[PDB]
Amino acid sequence: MEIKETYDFSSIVDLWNKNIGTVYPMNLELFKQNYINDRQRKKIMGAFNGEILIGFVIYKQWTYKSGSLKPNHKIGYINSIIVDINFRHQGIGTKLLDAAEEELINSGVKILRCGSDTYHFFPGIPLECLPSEEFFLVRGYKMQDYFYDLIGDVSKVDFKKPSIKDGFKVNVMKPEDRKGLFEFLEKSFSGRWLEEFIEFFQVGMKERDIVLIKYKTSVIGFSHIYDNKSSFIGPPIYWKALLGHNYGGLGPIGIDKTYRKQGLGRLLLYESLQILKKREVKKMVIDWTEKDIINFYGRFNFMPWKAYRKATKEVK
Amino acid sequence: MEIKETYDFSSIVDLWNKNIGTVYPMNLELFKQNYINDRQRKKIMGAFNGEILIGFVIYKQWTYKSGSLKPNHKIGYINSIIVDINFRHQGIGTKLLDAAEEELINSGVKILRCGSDTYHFFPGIPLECLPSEEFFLVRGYKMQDYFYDLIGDVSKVDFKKDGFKVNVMKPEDRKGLFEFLEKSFSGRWLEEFIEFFQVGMKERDIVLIKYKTSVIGFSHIYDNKSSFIGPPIYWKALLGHNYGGLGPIGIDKTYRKQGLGRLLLYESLQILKKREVKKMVIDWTEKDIINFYGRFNFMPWKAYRKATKEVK
Numbered sequence: 280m281e282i283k284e285t286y287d288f289s290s291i292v293d294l295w296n297k298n299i300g301t302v303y304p305m306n307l308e309l310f311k312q313n314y315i316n317d318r319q320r321k322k323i324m325g326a327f328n329g330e331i332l333i334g335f336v337i338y339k340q341w342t343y344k345s346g347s348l349k350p351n352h353k354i355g356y357i358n359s360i361i362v363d364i365n366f367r368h369q370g371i372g373t374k375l376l377d378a379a380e381e382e383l384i385n386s387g388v389k390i391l392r393c394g395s396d397t398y399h400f401f402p403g404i405p406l407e408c409l410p411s412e413e414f415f416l417v418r419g420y421k422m423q424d425y426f427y428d429l430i431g432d433v434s435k436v437d438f439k440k441p442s443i444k445d446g447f448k449v450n451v452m453k454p455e456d457r458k459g460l461f462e463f464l465e466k467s468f469s470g471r472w473l474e475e476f477i478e479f480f481q482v483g484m485k486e487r488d489i490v491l492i493k494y495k496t497s498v499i500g501f502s503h504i505y506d507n508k509s510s511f512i513g514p515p516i517y518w519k520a521l522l523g524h525n526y527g528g529l530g531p532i533g534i535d536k537t538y539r540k541q542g543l544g545r546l547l548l549y550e551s552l553q554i555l556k557k558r559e560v561k562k563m564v565i566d567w568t569e570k571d572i573i574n575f576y577g578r579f580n581f582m583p584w585k586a587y588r589k590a591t592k593e594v595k
Numbered sequence: 596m597e598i599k600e601t602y603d604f605s606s607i608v609d610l611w612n613k614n615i616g617t618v619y620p621m622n623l624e625l626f627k628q629n630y631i632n633d634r635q636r637k638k639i640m641g642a643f644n645g646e647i648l649i650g651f652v653i654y655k656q657w658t659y660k661s662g663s664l665k666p667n668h669k670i671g672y673i674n675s676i677i678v679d680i681n682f683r684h685q686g687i688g689t690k691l692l693d694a695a696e697e698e699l700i701n702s703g704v705k706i707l708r709c710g711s712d713t714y715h716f717f718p719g720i721p722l723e724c725l726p727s728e729e730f731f732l733v734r735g736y737k738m739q740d741y742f743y744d745l746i747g748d749v750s751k752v753d754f755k756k757d758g759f760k761v762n763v764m765k766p767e768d769r770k771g772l773f774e775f776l777e778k779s780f781s782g783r784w785l786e787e788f789i790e791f792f793q794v795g796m797k798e799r800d801i802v803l804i805k806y807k808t809s810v811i812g813f814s815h816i817y818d819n820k821s822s823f824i825g826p827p828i829y830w831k832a833l834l835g836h837n838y839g840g841l842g843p844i845g846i847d848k849t850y851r852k853q854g855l856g857r858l859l860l861y862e863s864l865q866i867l868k869k870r871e872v873k874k875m876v877i878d879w880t881e882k883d884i885i886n887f888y889g890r891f892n893f894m895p896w897k898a899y900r901k902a903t904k905e906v907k
């Protein structure tokens with residue numbers, strides 16, 4: 280058996296699906312979008328029996344800026360790791376993770392995160408991969424808090440518009456809203472969400488996938504929405520193969536800090552779902568939420584669908 | 596808003612599906628099967644706006660024997676409780692649960708369980724219902740351990756002893772199965788075999804492992820021809836075509852930790868595989884046992900939290 284770098288995205292896709300595809304159905308198109316466009320120092324290490332891939336690990340170090348923010352080189356990520364079901368418990372996963380970890384630590388990494396990377400597949404250890412928690416524990420990852428993807432069927436329920444302060448309006452993005460948007464982001468959301476706007480518009484995001492809330496002239500919030508027309512596949516629709524015909528999703532969503540806790544997110548959410556409903560969306564996902572914000576979406580009949588556990592290893 | 600007893604199953608099922616059908620798709624056949632066949636003292640209390648059902652609770656007291664076990668009347672169950680999404684946070688859940696708990700307690704119940712009943716829909720509070728834990732916590736329920744339904748696709752992967760034989764049950768096995776059950780699994784699983792056979796379970800849904808001519812273990816398996824709809828295939832609308840399941844599975848205590856469970860499992864999966872099963876579920880497992888199924892590529896799919904209230 281041999282460990283060496285690999286770029287055979289196809290064979291990686293097949294191994295993924297063969298082992299976990301029932302709950303995380305991967306496609307080559309999503310896989311390549313996310314691996315290829317990621318801008319961090321990244322690598323895929325493969326484990327091989329002769330010519331045959333029997334395992335892999337995808338790992339990154341934070342080396343590229345996040346909006347106005349510089350990279351913190353102390354952070355590394357395990358994007359994913361999977362050993363083939365017929366080759367488990369032979370030391371292969373350990374070998375593969377030792378190699379990834381060794382390389383990251385030599386490049387200055389002190390904190391290793393399970394998922395949560397840019398172009399992540401997972402916000403943390405999926406609950407479907409709960410048995411791997413013990414594997415990560417042995418290696419010195421600490422199991423921390425949970426995150427949830429939520430699911431709902433926006434076709435099935437009708438809601439009363441929450442009552443609305445005057446001056447505010449909410450509309451899908453027009454191309455001339457764009458300078459307005461980036462100013463607002465530079466001001467209120469200048470790390471990861473600013474960066475994602477930047478990169479995502481370069482690889483097929485359209486204004487129609489964006490909803491904006493205004494106080495008179497001014498942009499004070501956004502949501503990113505998804506349907507079967509979106510060409511950029513974002514987290515909410517990663518697992519669209521499970522979601523049926525007329526799938527959708529929503530996230531992120533953000534209101535300028537000075538405008539929060541006055542019902543405006545509720546209004547943005549309502550209208551963002553209204554748009555999706557009018558587009559005939561049925562089942563849709565809201566990705567990567569915290570336990571404390573679930574009921575904000577629950578008011579609209581969303582429920583937790585997947586769970587992920589944050590996990591972090593501190594290098595000695 | 597009126598609280599009173601209902602048996603309008605169709606209304607209940609519709610409300611069910613409107614609120615949680617995305618993750619727990621209910622059909623009227625399953626609903627009726629489980630409600631009508633349960634032998635406990637049971638009731639459904641509905642919440643109504645005029646003639647319109649806007650919430651319900653189903654609840655049960657353990658009043659009927661479980662195999663060799665006598666009923667313990669101290670145990671009650673909240674089978675399910677749902678208030679419609681447009682009527683939440685007005686006290687309806689509270690009134691329904693209060694009515695259920697008041698009746699159970701007046702009948703001698705001292706311990707209230709969320710799910711875990713005979714003909715349960717849930718082994719405990721689903722993770723999809725995680726926001727309800729607050730509602731129950733405030734009302735005195737303690738949140739305990741998790742259990743999991745596992746999922747796997749037997750169509751996707753291939754895998755690889757003296758006097759041990761595994762085969763689909765034959766009708767002549769009836770007696771041996773019963774004797775075995777009475778010896779090794781003489782509570783709830785014994786009760787299930789008795790009751791399931793009287794309501795449509797066939798010999799083809801049972802796999803037996805024998806040492807010589809002695810039954811020493813069994814599994815119950817499910818496909819799209821089973822007429823008994825048991826927990827592994829409750830949520831078959833989510834599993835695609837050629838769905839199946841497995842559970843329970845058991846080996847005589849005497850014979851465990853020697854690979855015989857593994858073999859019974861292997862052969863049971865083989866049989867399902869040969870029946871053209873794809874996506875299938877293993878219901879209600881403990882964390883400590885997930886890896887036993889995991890060797891065959893099964894993964895946690897749904898989680899449920901055990902929750903218990905002690906009446907004070």
Ligand SMILES: CC(=O)SCCNC(=O)CCNC(=O)[C@H](O)C(C)(C)COP(=O)(O)OP(=O)(O)OC[C@H]1O[C@@H](n2cnc3c(N)ncnc32)[C@H](O)[C@@H]1OP(=O)(O)O
Pocket residue numbers: 298299357358359360361362363366367368369370371372373374393394401403404405407408409411413414417
């Ligand atoms: C950020 C994320 O990617 S989260 C997703 C994590 N991935 C998954 O859940 C995918 C499905 N699971 C898997 O692919 C695998 O089980 C993995 C990747 C988690 C583990 O890979 P494996 O190759 O089985 O791991 P490995 O064999 O190194 O170690 C596992 C165990 O096997 C045994 N083992 C280790 N080395 C050997 C050896 N040389 N000989 C025999 N047994 C061994 C040990 O008991 C070890 O115990 P541990 O759990 O305490 O470490």
Ligand SMILES: CC(=O)SCCNC(=O)CCNC(=O)[C@H](O)C(C)(C)COP(=O)(O)OP(=O)(O)OC[C@H]1O[C@@H](n2cnc3c(N)ncnc32)[C@H](O)[C@@H]1OP(=O)(O)O
Pocket residue numbers: 614615673674675676677678679682683684685686687688689690709710717719720721724725727729730733
């Ligand atoms: C075993 C099982 O069934 S597990 C599955 C449980 N079911 C579900 O998860 C389905 C989805 N959820 C639901 O159906 C509901 O949310 C339930 C059944 C959990 C609760 O139903 P509700 O009718 O919202 O409950 P109710 O309104 O009585 O109480 C909710 C809160 O609103 C409060 N409330 C009561 N009246 C009012 C009012 N007029 N205005 C605002 N709040 C109110 C209650 O005090 C309560 O707060 P508390 O928990 O801090 O005491």
